Write an enzyme that holds these catalytic residues in place. Structure first.
Site, mmCIF file in Angstrom:
data_model
loop_
_atom_site.group_PDB
_atom_site.id
_atom_site.type_symbol
_atom_site.label_atom_id
_atom_site.label_comp_id
_atom_site.label_asym_id
_atom_site.label_seq_id
_atom_site.Cartn_x
_atom_site.Cartn_y
_atom_site.Cartn_z
ATOM 1 N N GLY A 157 0.823 -1.224 0.000
ATOM 2 C CA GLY A 157 0.000 0.000 0.000
ATOM 3 C C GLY A 157 0.848 1.261 0.000
ATOM 4 C CB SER A 158 0.296 4.485 1.846
ATOM 5 O OG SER A 158 -1.023 4.762 1.401
ATOM 6 C CB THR A 159 4.682 1.114 3.026
ATOM 7 O OG1 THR A 159 4.234 -0.009 2.266
ATOM 8 C CG2 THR A 159 3.954 1.164 4.351
ATOM 9 C CB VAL A 160 5.104 1.223 -2.568
ATOM 10 C CG1 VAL A 160 4.779 -0.161 -2.032
ATOM 11 C CG2 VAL A 160 3.871 1.862 -3.193
#
Length: 456
Positions: A196-199
């Site tokens: 998710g958003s961590t990339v």
């Protein structure tokens, strides 16, 4: 004599405590046989019938010595080795357990079964002192949130050593009675989820390297369409800087950065940071996650890949990713054993390019960001909150509200990469996991006597 397992400071985590084994063929019906039945918890009918050959195994020596001094007909005592785990529940999943024959079945006990028998002592990368702090905050957080599960992995950015790997729920390795098989699984290395958003930190890096954007560049972040799908953030913004895109977790932001580059751009950068690559510890069930092997990329697929969908990671895999961010683009292999520095690392991105992205990531921890609750007092931190909806071992995904916070500290000169994951928090009254990262990372920083790097 099975080898003694110890932490990095030489504290005991697994030791071999000695324990006994108990083994004219008519019962004399003397007073001794009753006192035998009372001692071994074995009724006269059961005792007599089961021999009419082992009787009891992994038996306390105290009972064992009381049995020898009855001197019954051809009773024979054999020496066995029950493993005692001082930490127990705290590091159940790392250390694992041994079977009745002292054979490694789970954890490092199985991973290093050869070395620990064929025997010398094992020194792990884990620090009991940290693991204890990591585990307590996680266990309390899972309970506080009424969440089904929780996982925390703490990696050194410089050595690639695993300093801690706590899972909640845990099990009692000293007494494996009433615990299911599903509780035994090391959820930190087996359960995978869409990152998710961590990339999005990696998206900004790629876009900066491909020259698509400068570090002060401002983008039109109004909602738009890709193959008849509306790309929009819940929090609507007219304009955001590359900093703002990470700060506000702007899907619109990253999607435009992504669609400005070739489809292969992110596929490369993700793979470099170790997405869909084996963690390569000896642990049973260790998953390499899922990664696209595809050929044709639609515009929408290139965008959803920037949001962190179409691939999956173990909490450990993600910890290694953020370890590579803390090291400023130096990809080192993971170690569960203690290692003498310096540890050889492969550079996958330019040093000055990654450092600016780490500085942008501090805005998530700072006001206006989605990770302000994770903020440490005195320490600058570079974090990134995210969310997924399904999580499980490959082919066994369960639809759960997975909240997690991947981050690196201290921002000025990173020493640690931390990944906290709270699984299906059934609470009322990302935002669930932000505080846990705070307490954990804060505790680790003060414990290792790191200096606060907050501004004057």
């Amino acid at each position: 004599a099975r080898g003694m397992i110890s932490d990095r400071s030489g504290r005991p985590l697994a030791v071999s405590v000695p324990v006994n084994a108990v083994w004219q063929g008519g019962i004399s019906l003397d007073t001794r046989w009753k006192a035998l039945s009372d001692a071994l918890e074995i009724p006269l009918d059961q005792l007599a019938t089961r021999i009419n050959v082992y009787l009891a195994r992994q038996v306390n020596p105290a009972i064992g010595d009381y049995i020898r001094k009855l001197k019954l007909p051809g009773i024979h005592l054999r020496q066995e080795s029950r493993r005692y785990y001082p930490a127990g529940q705290v590091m159940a999943h790392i250390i694992g357990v041994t079977n009745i024959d002292g054979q490694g079945i789970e954890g490092v006990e199985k991973s290093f079964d050869r070395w620990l028998t064929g025997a010398h002592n094992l020194v792990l990368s884990v620090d009991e002192r940290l693991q204890a702090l990591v585990y307590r905050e996680l266990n309390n957080a899972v309970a506080f949130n009424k969440a089904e599960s929780g996982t925390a992995v703490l990696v050194d950015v410089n050595t690639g050593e695993v300093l801690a790997m706590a899972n909640s729920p845990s099990y009692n390795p000293n007494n494996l009675t009433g615990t299911p098989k599903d509780a035994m699984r090391n959820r930190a290395i087996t359960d995978i989820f869409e990152p998710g958003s961590t990339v999005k930190p990696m998206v900004v890096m790629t876009a900066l390297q491909h020259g698509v954007v400068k570090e002060n560049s401002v983008l039109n972040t109004l909602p738009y369409f890709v193959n008849g799908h509306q790309i929009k953030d819940v929090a609507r913004y007219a304009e955001l800087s590359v900093t703002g895109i990470l700060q506000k977790s702007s899907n619109v932001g990253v999607s435009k950065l992504a669609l400005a580059m070739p489809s292969s751009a992110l596929v490369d950068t993700y793979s470099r940071f170790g997405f869909g690559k084996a963690t390569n510890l000896g642990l049973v069930g260790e998953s390499s996650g899922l990664y696209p092997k595809k050929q044709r990329w639609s515009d929408i697929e290139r965008a959803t890949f920037s949001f962190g969908y179409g691939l999956m990671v173990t909490p450990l895999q993600l910890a290694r990713v953020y370890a590579t961010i803390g090291s400023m683009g130096v990809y080192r292999p993971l170690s569960i054993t203690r290692v003498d520095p310096p540890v050889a690392g492969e550079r996958i991105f330019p040093e000055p390019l990654v450092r600016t992205v780490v500085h942008m990531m501090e805005s998530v921890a700072l006001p206006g960001g989605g990770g302000t609750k994770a903020a440490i007092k005195g320490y600058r931190i570079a974090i990134k909150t995210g969310t997924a909806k399904k999580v499980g071992p490959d082919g066994k995904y369960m639809d759960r509200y997975l909240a997690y916070t991947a981050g690196v500290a201290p921002a000025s000169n990173p020493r640690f990469a931390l990944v906290v994951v709270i699984n299906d928090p059934q609470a009322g009254k990302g935002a669930v996991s932000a505080p846990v990262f705070g307490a954990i990372m804060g505790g680790v920083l003060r414990t290792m006597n790191i200096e606060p790097d907050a501004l004057p």
